[PDB]
């Protein structure tokens, strides 16, 4: 998925915010990796994506 920077920190197994709470929820005992890449050069558009 594509998430905005101020909500990347909301992706932890346990955390609050509109993403952690309503869009993507991880188990609190989850095993795995959340790997992030800056895609500004690909996803942003002058008129807005």
């Amino acid at each position: 998925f594509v998430i905005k920077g101020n909500e990347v920190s909301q992706i932890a197994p346990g955390q609050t915010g509109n993403i952690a709470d309503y869009n993507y929820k991880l188990p609190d005992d989850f095993t795995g990796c959340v790997i992030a890449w800056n895609s500004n050069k690909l996803d942003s558009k002058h008129s807005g994506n």
Binding site: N6, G14, Q15, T16, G17, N18
Partner: protein
């Protein structure tokens, strides 16, 4: 150096409104989890600003 203290009492709290006032740099709780403050807010409550 002269921080302000606001006394909060005789109210019904509701802490989801605190996510509307501003995006946060940090929201770190000690002795209580961020997800449960709607309940468990009791006794003297003070806002150090």
């Amino acid at each position: 150096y002269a921080w302000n203290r606001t006394r909060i009492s005789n109210c019904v709290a509701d802490y989801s409104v605190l996510y509307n006032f501003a995006p946060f740099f940090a929201f770190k709780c000690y002795g209580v989890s961020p997800t449960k403050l709607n309940d468990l807010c009791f006794t003297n409550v003070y806002a150090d600003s």
